[PDB]
Structure formats: C-alpha cells, structure tokens
Scaffold this active site. Structure first.
Site, PDB file in Angstrom:
ATOM      1  N   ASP A  95       0.728  -1.179  -0.175  1.00  0.00           N
ATOM      2  CA  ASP A  95       0.068   0.012  -0.017  1.00  0.00           C
ATOM      3  C   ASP A  95       0.845   1.233  -0.065  1.00  0.00           C
ATOM      4  OD1 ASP A  95      -1.928   1.876   0.147  1.00  0.00           O
ATOM      5  OD2 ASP A  95      -3.071   1.014   1.977  1.00  0.00           O
ATOM      6  N   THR A  96       0.886   1.875  -1.067  1.00  0.00           N
ATOM      7  CA  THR A  96       1.770   3.131  -1.299  1.00  0.00           C
ATOM      8  C   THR A  96       1.000   4.211  -0.643  1.00  0.00           C
ATOM      9  OG1 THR A  96       0.581   3.821  -3.526  1.00  0.00           O
ATOM     10  CG2 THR A  96       2.755   2.442  -3.619  1.00  0.00           C
ATOM     11  N   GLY A  97      -0.232   3.948  -0.369  1.00  0.00           N
ATOM     12  CA  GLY A  97      -0.948   5.263   0.370  1.00  0.00           C
ATOM     13  C   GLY A  97      -0.820   5.293   2.058  1.00  0.00           C
TER      14      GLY A  97
HETATM   15  C1  LIG Z   1     -12.790  -6.168   4.849  1.00  0.00           C
HETATM   16  C2  LIG Z   1     -12.786  -4.859   4.084  1.00  0.00           C
HETATM   17  O1  LIG Z   1     -13.405  -3.913   4.967  1.00  0.00           O
HETATM   18  P1  LIG Z   1     -13.606  -2.153   4.287  1.00  0.00           P
HETATM   19  O2  LIG Z   1     -14.179  -2.701   3.057  1.00  0.00           O
HETATM   20  C3  LIG Z   1     -12.062  -1.250   4.562  1.00  0.00           C
HETATM   21  O3  LIG Z   1     -11.124  -1.956   3.907  1.00  0.00           O
HETATM   22  C4  LIG Z   1     -10.162  -1.237   3.442  1.00  0.00           C
HETATM   23  C5  LIG Z   1      -9.398  -0.274   4.594  1.00  0.00           C
HETATM   24  C6  LIG Z   1      -8.266   0.484   4.144  1.00  0.00           C
HETATM   25  C7  LIG Z   1      -7.316   0.292   3.175  1.00  0.00           C
HETATM   26  C8  LIG Z   1      -6.024   0.904   2.782  1.00  0.00           C
HETATM   27  C9  LIG Z   1      -6.352   2.223   2.314  1.00  0.00           C
HETATM   28  N1  LIG Z   1      -7.517   2.181   1.154  1.00  0.00           N
HETATM   29  C10 LIG Z   1      -8.850   2.730   1.202  1.00  0.00           C
HETATM   30  O4  LIG Z   1      -9.213   3.654   2.023  1.00  0.00           O
HETATM   31  O5  LIG Z   1      -9.484   2.830  -0.071  1.00  0.00           O
HETATM   32  C11 LIG Z   1     -10.671   3.272  -0.232  1.00  0.00           C
HETATM   33  C12 LIG Z   1     -11.115   3.977  -1.265  1.00  0.00           C
HETATM   34  O6  LIG Z   1     -11.075   2.688  -2.194  1.00  0.00           O
HETATM   35  C13 LIG Z   1     -11.690   1.686  -1.446  1.00  0.00           C
HETATM   36  O7  LIG Z   1     -10.877   0.409  -1.456  1.00  0.00           O
HETATM   37  C14 LIG Z   1     -10.300  -0.097  -0.393  1.00  0.00           C
HETATM   38  C15 LIG Z   1     -11.143   0.633   0.609  1.00  0.00           C
HETATM   39  C16 LIG Z   1     -11.813   1.719  -0.176  1.00  0.00           C
HETATM   40  C17 LIG Z   1      -5.326   3.126   2.012  1.00  0.00           C
HETATM   41  O8  LIG Z   1      -4.712   2.681   0.863  1.00  0.00           O
HETATM   42  C18 LIG Z   1      -4.360   3.482   2.889  1.00  0.00           C
HETATM   43  N2  LIG Z   1      -5.041   4.429   3.964  1.00  0.00           N
HETATM   44  C19 LIG Z   1      -4.541   5.842   3.968  1.00  0.00           C
HETATM   45  C20 LIG Z   1      -5.210   6.672   2.780  1.00  0.00           C
HETATM   46  C21 LIG Z   1      -6.709   6.895   2.889  1.00  0.00           C
HETATM   47  C22 LIG Z   1      -4.540   8.021   2.860  1.00  0.00           C
HETATM   48  S1  LIG Z   1      -5.612   3.986   5.583  1.00  0.00           S
HETATM   49  O9  LIG Z   1      -5.699   2.286   5.315  1.00  0.00           O
HETATM   50  O10 LIG Z   1      -6.549   4.577   6.074  1.00  0.00           O
HETATM   51  C23 LIG Z   1      -3.858   4.290   6.494  1.00  0.00           C
HETATM   52  C24 LIG Z   1      -4.238   5.552   7.723  1.00  0.00           C
HETATM   53  C25 LIG Z   1      -3.065   5.681   8.458  1.00  0.00           C
HETATM   54  C26 LIG Z   1      -1.947   4.564   8.562  1.00  0.00           C
HETATM   55  C27 LIG Z   1      -0.613   5.004   9.580  1.00  0.00           C
HETATM   56  C28 LIG Z   1      -0.162   3.767  10.254  1.00  0.00           C
HETATM   57  O11 LIG Z   1       0.438   5.602   8.617  1.00  0.00           O
HETATM   58  C29 LIG Z   1      -1.593   3.596   7.616  1.00  0.00           C
HETATM   59  C30 LIG Z   1      -2.704   3.369   6.549  1.00  0.00           C
HETATM   60  C31 LIG Z   1      -7.696  -0.765   2.051  1.00  0.00           C
HETATM   61  C32 LIG Z   1      -9.137  -1.723   2.089  1.00  0.00           C
HETATM   62  O12 LIG Z   1     -15.088  -1.789   5.261  1.00  0.00           O
HETATM   63  C33 LIG Z   1     -14.544  -0.689   6.211  1.00  0.00           C
HETATM   64  C34 LIG Z   1     -14.002  -1.408   7.366  1.00  0.00           C
END
Ligand SMILES: CCOP(=O)(COc1ccc(C[C@H](NC(=O)O[C@H]2CO[C@H]3OCC[C@H]32)[C@H](O)CN(CC(C)C)S(=O)(=O)c2ccc([C@@H](C)O)cc2)cc1)OCC
Lengths: 99, 99
Positions: free
Chosen positions: B25-27
C-alpha cells in the site's frame, strides 16, 4: 516516471479544469477526493476505509489527468482525509508496483 | 517482480512466525496488521483514514518478510479490516511505482 516511496507519492492532478494534489494509493480500489464542485450528474454511494464507512458523491466517466497521464473513470467525492488516486485510475495510466 | 493493479496487490508476508496476506500500500505511511498477540513492549496509538480512527498497538523493530524480501521496522497491530504494508517497509524492499 519511477517513483520511490521515501516520501508520500503525491502528484499534481487536473480535474474539472482545476489543479490539485493527490496521493497515488495502491491500497485504494477507488479514487476518492475531498469535497469539491464537479459538473454533471452524480449518485449517492457508500465507501469503507480503515475507520468505517462514509457517504460520497459518485461521478462517473470523469476526465482526470494524473501526472501528465490522462484517465477517464469514476471519481468519488466526500470527507476523505486526503485526495487518493485508486487502482481504478492507476491502471488507466499504466501504473505498476516493482521491486 | 512487477505487480499490475487490475486486482488488489496482495502478497504473502511472514511476521511473528505466522504467514498472512497483506496489501502493498503506497498510500499508507506505516504498516498496519490484523490483531495478533506479538511478544514485546508496545505503545498505544490512534491511526485514521476514511471513516475515522482506530486504536492500535505500536511495535518497533519487527521483522517482516515480504515476498521473500526481509524488512524490519514499526508495525501497528489492531482491529484493521485489512493488512497493509506501508511505505516504512516498502522502501526497505526496494518497491517503486512506475508508469
Ligand atoms: C474487509 C474490508 O473492509 P472495508 O471494505 C475497508 O477495507 C480497507 C481499509 C483500508 C485500506 C487501505 C487504504 N485504502 C482505502 O481507504 O481505500 C478506499 C477507497 O477505495 C476503497 O478500497 C479499499 C477501501 C476503499 C489506503 O490505501 C491507506 N490509508 C490511508 C489513505 C486513506 C490516505 S489507511 O488504510 O486509512 C491508513 C491510515 C493511517 C496509517 C498509518 C499507520 O500510517 C496507515 C494506513 C484498504 C481496504 O470496510 C470498512 C472496514
């Protein structure tokens, strides 16, 4: 370009004729931008992140240029902490992970 | 290797003697993994993204093997809905975005 990850992979994007900064986010299925004005129709949608679910405005087939590469796809607009470019658009510009 | 983004960039990791699946996860600035009862001292932390914040435990200097590439750094553990390998470890395995 080749983008290392010692810093956040932030890039300039152009959407609705306006420049913004967004994060290339391989962990996001979808592209989610902070609150903004976009022309055309939109539909209510829900999306889930690390902290739960939020309400977003879904804009389909939107022109967006990402770091000089054009894409046309779905853009979600809502209370995201940061503008994220998700895989739906990263695939359009031919983005891959390499190591 | 080169990972396309048609599907989620899931890979097998080894942490604390256990195999798991996690997103490259680059994000994500840092690495967040599902609840697991690791040994050692830890520090409570709150991390936020789409939908709000969750409570996690911060472990430092944890060894993780990502696609056979060893890394060592901070790992946050808690009720995350998905395992994400963040930039703190992606840089250690030489991971880049390319388009
Ligand atoms: C079983 C599945 O449950 P869910 O579906 C959610 O699953 C998920 C949850 C999170 C992710 C990864 C995140 N992607 C995400 O938000 O994507 C959205 C949009 O596109 C959809 O696809 C996937 C979800 C939708 C993102 O890459 C990384 N983030 C930061 C970004 C937002 C700036 S972070 O995670 O918030 C994060 C915060 C702080 C830190 C500190 C340590 O540095 C490290 C990481 C992928 C799938 O239901 C809800 C429970």
């Amino acid at each position: 370009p080749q983008i290392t990850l010692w810093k956040r992979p932030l890039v300039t994007i152009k959407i609705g004729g306006q420049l913004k900064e967004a994060l290339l986010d391989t962990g996001a299925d979808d592209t989610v931008l902070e609150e903004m004005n976009l022309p055309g129709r939109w539909k209510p949608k829900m999306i889930g992140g690390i902290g739960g679910f939020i309400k977003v405005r879904q804009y389909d087939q939107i022109l967006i240029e990402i770091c000089g590469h054009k894409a046309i796809g779905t853009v979600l607009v809502g209370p995201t902490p940061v503008n994220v470019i998700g895989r739906n658009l990263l695939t359009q510009i031919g983005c891959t992970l390499n190591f």
